[PDB]
Amino acid sequence: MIKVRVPDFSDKKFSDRWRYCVGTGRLGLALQKEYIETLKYVKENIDFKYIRGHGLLCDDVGIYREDVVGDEVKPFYNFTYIDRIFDSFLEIGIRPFVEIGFMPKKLASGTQTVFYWEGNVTPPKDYEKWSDLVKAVLHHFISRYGIEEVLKWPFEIWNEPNLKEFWKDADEKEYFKLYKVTAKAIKEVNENLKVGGPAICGGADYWIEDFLNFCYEENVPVDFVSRHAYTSKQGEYTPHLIYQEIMPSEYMLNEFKTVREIIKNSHFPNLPFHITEYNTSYSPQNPVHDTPFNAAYIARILSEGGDYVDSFSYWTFSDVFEERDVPRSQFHGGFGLVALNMIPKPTFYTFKFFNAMGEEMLYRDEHMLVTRRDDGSVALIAWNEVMDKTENPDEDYEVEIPVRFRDVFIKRQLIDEEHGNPWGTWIHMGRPRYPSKEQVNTLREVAKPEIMTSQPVANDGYLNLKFKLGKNAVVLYELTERIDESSTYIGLDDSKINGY
Amino acid sequence: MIKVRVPDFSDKKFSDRWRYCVGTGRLGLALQKEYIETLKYVKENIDFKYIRGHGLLCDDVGIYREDVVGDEVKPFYNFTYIDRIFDSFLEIGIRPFVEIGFMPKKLASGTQTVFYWEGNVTPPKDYEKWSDLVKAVLHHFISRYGIEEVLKWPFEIWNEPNLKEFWKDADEKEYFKLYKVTAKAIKEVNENLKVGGPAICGGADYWIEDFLNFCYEENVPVDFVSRHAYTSKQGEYTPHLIYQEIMPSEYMLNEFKTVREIIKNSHFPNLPFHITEYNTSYSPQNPVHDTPFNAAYIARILSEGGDYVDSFSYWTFSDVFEERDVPRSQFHGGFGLVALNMIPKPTFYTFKFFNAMGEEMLYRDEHMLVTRRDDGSVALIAWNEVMDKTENPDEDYEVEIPVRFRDVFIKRQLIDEEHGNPWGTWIHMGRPRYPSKEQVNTLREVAKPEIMTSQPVANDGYLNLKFKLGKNAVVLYELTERIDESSTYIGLDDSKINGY
Amino acid sequence: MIKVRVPDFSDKKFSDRWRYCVGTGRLGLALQKEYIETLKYVKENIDFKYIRGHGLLCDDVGIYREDVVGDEVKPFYNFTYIDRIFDSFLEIGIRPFVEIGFMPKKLASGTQTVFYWEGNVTPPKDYEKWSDLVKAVLHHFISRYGIEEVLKWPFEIWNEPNLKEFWKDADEKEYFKLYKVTAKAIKEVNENLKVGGPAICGGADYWIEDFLNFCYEENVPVDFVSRHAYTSKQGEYTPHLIYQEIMPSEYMLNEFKTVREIIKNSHFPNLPFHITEYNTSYSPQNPVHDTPFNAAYIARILSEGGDYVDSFSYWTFSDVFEERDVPRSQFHGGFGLVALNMIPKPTFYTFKFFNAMGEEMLYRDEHMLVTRRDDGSVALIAWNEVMDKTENPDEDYEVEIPVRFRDVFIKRQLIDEEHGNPWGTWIHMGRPRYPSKEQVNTLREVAKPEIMTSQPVANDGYLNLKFKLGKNAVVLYELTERIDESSTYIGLDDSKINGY
Amino acid sequence: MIKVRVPDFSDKKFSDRWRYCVGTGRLGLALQKEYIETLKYVKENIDFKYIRGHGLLCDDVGIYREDVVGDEVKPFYNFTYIDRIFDSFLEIGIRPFVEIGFMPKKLASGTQTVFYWEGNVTPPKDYEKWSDLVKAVLHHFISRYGIEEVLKWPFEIWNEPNLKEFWKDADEKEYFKLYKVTAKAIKEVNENLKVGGPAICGGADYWIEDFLNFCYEENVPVDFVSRHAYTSKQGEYTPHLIYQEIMPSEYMLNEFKTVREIIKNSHFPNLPFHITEYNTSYSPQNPVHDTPFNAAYIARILSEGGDYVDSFSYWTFSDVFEERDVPRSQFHGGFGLVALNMIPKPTFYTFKFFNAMGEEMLYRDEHMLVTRRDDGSVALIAWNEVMDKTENPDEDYEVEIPVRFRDVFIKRQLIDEEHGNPWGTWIHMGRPRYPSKEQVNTLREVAKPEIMTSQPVANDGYLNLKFKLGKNAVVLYELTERIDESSTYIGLDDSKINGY
């Protein structure tokens, strides 16, 4: 098994970089009732500071237009939709990790598009027109929300320009130019606004080295580096879904650690580094996302990810998505932490559990994190992800946890194949694509962790915990100080109740 | 164990008389935010039709007042509070099972009072004035709610008049006179208004014989007989609480059965019989009410009480109560199905579980009830009350349930000593009297039945249910047809996901 | 002025056909938070039973798709969105007046499209697949909401086929076929499902005749005739808006009266007549919709339309629209009764005012309507639209209304250029395109009718009302019985208060 | 009329001391639903920082109890209720201006009580037991809310001890002893908790000179001086209401000033001064509270009171009151800014209007206040209370206001006998005591100020306002820069709309 004696002291800190940002489907979808109810719901449980998605300039949001009169053609920047979208974000208490893109059609130099909703991925016909659009939007943001607010919004230029699907011909140089023109337009508005990139996907880090060298040699400002991370191997789509083998979380933490080094060996060694999008599979139709395995797996990344990066946004917070058309079933492998109808997937609870962690990191290994909060209470999280099939997926634990107080109240939350696994149940129901309200209700009741309370006696400043982790289980223990008030109950004696 | 083969048909039906009416603390408390929130919470889970409680005429509600102009004394009827209370009841979707009482101070003949809030319990100094009061109030309900709504309200006269604590000297003669004047006044406003009594507690059923014969020989209107029922032996209060031995459910059931028989053998053999108030203990400070035990014990009463009475009102719906002063801790043995801070007790889920029962009663025995719904689905409810210390409380079950389909989706809900037991957690916390918001949150999360789902196949029209019931457990099983859609998912194969 | 003595009684009735249905932007938009909040807000004030809009089969809702397996093209029906859309409707208490259309891209024969959102308007490439899509959809509805529910939904086939914009070549022949097939496939699902058409716009009434003869001769089912009505003359769009002279309401009423005759003269003389879409201007950018004029104008139609049709649906209920792109300002001449940010336009209150109408019509002329409600109270609505430019816009009135009671309470509500005119205030602010929260709040405070109360003593069963209507005003007078309680207050005397 | 030229200059500030605190009925009522919804309502409209009322220790809240075990009698402090009350207050965002009192029954030395709810007005039998109570309560507050939070709560000792009705025999010396014991108990808990008194009503300011002198001689700590002020003369109660002449606001403002000077000449010259209770009439049944008069009257105090005091709390925020038994009609002369059923009274809008004032005072006199906000926009409030019967009550105005912009947007709000006067409408209904839902709805609709917008151009930095103030009217004018966007609407032209 795994015997562990948690140190009573430690000089390691656990930050909340894991909850800095969360991803989302294109901004246009944010106008949806379903989208907003779910965002509010997530924010009532996980305090994400930012939310990052594509589509700010896409035509459904409808910002860039052009009015034609016999005499001239002049641009018209329409803010009716983003005002509403950004107004609701600020109301909910979350800020946009703005992504500049994609190319509105009236400015497109080409016709290439991406996804079901067809965002244009070609450079602008006229870079100056693109520069004025960016400034027009920035000035509108300042006008409506004030410069103090907007200055907190980082601006990421484009998305995965290294892939021919998001950027015409994967033209590295044209990207650097787009970045230059955009960065200059933003800075012109206000020199303190944060700009960055290159928002590339893995397997092309020579882009980050080039990107940084370009900003250096061309004297172009950069306030942060962005990149994406996935651990899913190549797969084969069916007209409904796709399966991909997920490599261990080790490969992702290593990619983090690797690109971090590239930034420190570059001309801008202290640049903050954001993983603006990550998950196991990079497909919005891969079943693994809705499983308990996904939640046990992500656990470690939330545990160690912050050691190498400034943030890492989980893609996504909801199944309200469309890159591959409208979802066709209650569970379809969406990126969402929360499935449609506000049904939290196990992964949702992994994030929820980390909300209990303190800054003092007493102990940590590849399958367990132990911290202490301000008040002195101790929280512990352990996970048991099953990478491949086996007959011994169980793992026993015995941990000695240091505790200030003598009397302890214990609160244990758990999720695994039988607890907080709405997916398994949906399978019991016959995988309905469009369940009834009664069925969705049963899925909500099921989608909750198991809660168990107890009390022990901490001896010489320590408490011994023994537990077993089933297949793909994630557990959260909280040890707070118990202050017994039983003596104040005159005549208290439970044994005088029938059977106790 | 307990092997049972449930029949395909039966000549028995199961009514919903078990949810006709529920009890409440004095009406004046309906003015509380805590009270209304809680009532709305119960109604969202249990479709109670009526709500029965004391205090309609008590001075906190303030209906009866007297204005003095010189040496003249004119009465004044203030409807400000009742209007707000009854307005809030009808808005929530529940009607009052009116209880005419107690005695307004200005109309009292003596000074004897009952409870911490001192409801005067002496007859009126002038039965005329009392009669006018009764008529003034009804004409107001009529005037504000319309005769059509008020005709749906029954009017029970007084409360347990056979006890000297609730009616001076337990004067049976004066009560019969009280009843005559009151019933007469009611009928005069509108003879369709249901009036009844005698509202006595157990151990004095001769009071009913005397009552009925009093009406049958005095031609006094009577639309229903009401009585209370408990199974708790005399106990001895401590300044904080009291314990009492609770007897088996048989006693209460046989009591329902006895009195029901005292009526069929009466001069009004067809009068409806209402148990306007029941529970294990008749004390608002008996810890037994907050236990899983209570939940299991009342389960059988819901299953059979309907056979003998037109309705039985569990006392009460909430711990918002003040008979023995303001509650002094999160759990204090109050009558409520719901503890303060809207924390449902296990008995709450016993009622909740019965909502799954259909009208077709296929099988039933002292510890189990099986029914079929309109759509063919079948539901089962078993309970295991452990009425005494025992090294072994567990019970084994094996039930063959007839099902008109082969593929079955199973939804199981369980409450016992480790599930849906906020009381057990409260103790784990050191029995906090005034718990913080985090504690109350923990209690709320624990206070939920364990939901568990599965899917098996039926053989020879029978689905075999094998399960054991732990200490004081209550389980719900709903078996519905599983209509599998798994075939419409192209490429579907969970084995292609890590570990699966 | 206009002196009118309202007849003591009458045998004519005012029906609520005016509130039977209301229009809406494309169904896909019903997914919007703004849409839903607005629909609920409307339904709390005006009880519309049905809602009519296009886009049911348009690809944004996404019902029709095609899976490519190997070399076989299998059709797929995705209900994720209409299920969410129709649930919200039914949840709110409003049913869809279904409109079958337009052509999903995959089944489209041509490439022609209409509107900013490109709804394909060509016939199907295979009328078989069309019929199968139709039955697939209907069955699902049946399966999800039950046949008893789906039976209450009428089915309109396509939209204004008599116009090249919505139907390729306005081919009258094809429409009759598409209708034959569609009206058939529906019936095959269930013979009681109401079907109708041709839902043409005014001017081409020859279509209704050729339609009612097509059915008769080719033996095609028909349960209703649908047509649209508009009184706006042609105009010339600027890239932002359009102005159009609006003809008098008389033109519209005459058309209702006309087309209704064509039906009573046809083979189907008892067919119901539905005006599934009407308003002054048929453009979503004609400022007239946002004005006090548009409200005093529509008053007379809500007042008389019912005399000729089974229903007439105001297009639309909200400015949440996109036919001509995303709106570019708080007021942009949208069809809505309610402007974005839930700001009611004066027309909204014209409908609202009609709720006060009883069924007993005592009087009515081109500018007034007086009805008596069941309880006896009387209600009056008078409107003064200013059609052209004049220098004497105001109108004086003197109406003797028959009043059952002797003491009257008068509640007067009024809207005009100075009251309930958020548009005028919007102008005072400088016509802001994207108003701040404070400005929207001011618009909301302003967007309400003026309210005045008073009290008169009816003499000889009649009450004399002298009022003055300003430019484009619409007023509501409710006359309920006044039962004075002042005498029950001992010492009551306002003169004993400073200055009274 | 009155002609005023507001100087474009400011040497004095206008603070928000007017909204520092508001009054309330006894704490035990804070448990009512009506109460809380109303407190939330008021807070959404006025940012009151504190709320001050009686009954913290009274027995309905029930903190002080005594358990009798055998012979030994042990005190028990039950926090169930205040915990709920103060939880609700902090949740809403308003802190308690704690008033220690009255005397719990079991600790009383005498039998004298005050008000319908009978709060005990005699000194404690044992000052040590009272001292322990104070400590227990404070220690609990710290335990539940944290020290940082409780340190912001001021502690006023008792209420109007100078009156025989609230303090047995108006024993000045016994009150100073009560203050010392209490203050010392408070300071024992925490040295920096704010304590003060004497909370006397007018006419006995020597209690104040004696109070400060007592604290000096006995070295008893004191942090503030509290006092009450009313301007109603003697009246003669009827069993239902009371009338009293209200003296000019000058009287009250001069009392604030007189007492302020007394504190300055004491041993503690810099002590803050709080008027913990004020209004016109001090009776919870004097109709003046509900009239427009009261609104125009209070206007001047809100305007000048902050000049002499650190706060002045209007008694009360809501009609939820019981001092003189449960209210008996929709309007009854309650102290509330808001009447039952959340119907704001005119005074409510006087406070609401003051939210508009900025810190820069530009002009002020007995009937007008003009200030400038931080963004440069200007606000003006003028009032015209009619102190006595008159045929000529109106008051005309011409005010020249300086504005830094040329294009001005004007928002004007007005309450008077005809606008926002629910009392007036209520009378029109016959003065119903228990209005129907419909009538309550009509009053709510009337209970709003008249809103009117417009736009003028200033001439040489000045805008001229011309208006007439009706009887008891209060007007608010907000002038903000008008930034016209009309030029961006291509083809805009309202004249192209029928009648425009």
Ligand SMILES: *[C@H]1OC[C@@H](O)[C@H](O)[C@H]1F
């Ligand atoms: C990163 O990979 C996942 C995909 O859904 C995102 O759109 C892309 F940016």
Ligand SMILES: *[C@H]1OC[C@@H](O)[C@H](O)[C@H]1F
């Ligand atoms: C019935 O017993 C319980 C008690 O609380 C009730 O008041 C009584 F009527």
Ligand SMILES: *[C@H]1OC[C@@H](O)[C@H](O)[C@H]1F
């Ligand atoms: C009827 O005219 C108005 C337009 O918006 C609709 O689309 C059309 F059917």
Ligand SMILES: *[C@H]1OC[C@@H](O)[C@H](O)[C@H]1F
């Ligand atoms: C001050 O006068 C008004 C009364 O209602 C308060 O109780 C008193 F303190």
